[PDB]
DNA sequence: CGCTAATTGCTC
DNA sequence: GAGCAATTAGCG
């Protein structure tokens, strides 16, 4: 069954990712899509890396 | 193993 | 169509 590769983000992205998520817990359309381009990532790239944050964030303080 | 990226299938 | 919970799975 198929899967995409799973992304090595640089330290750069995951850098920038933390600091959009310190900002916003949420992403707008045109925030992600402005991510991604900032980012040289996938709207599914920001998307996902956005879920897995909060559930991350929901663990750790819930 | 632990961290986390990607997938699935559901709610809303 | 975005979020979320449960899950699968890559890599250090």
Known sequence: KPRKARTAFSDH???QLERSFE???YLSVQD???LA???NLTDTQVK???QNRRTK???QTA
């Open 37 to 39: 381009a900032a980012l």
């Open 48 to 50: 996902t890396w956005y």
């Open 32 to 34: 992600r899509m402005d």
């Open 13 to 15: 992205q995951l850098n």
């Open 23 to 25: 900002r916003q817990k």
């Open 57 to 59: 964030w929901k663990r």
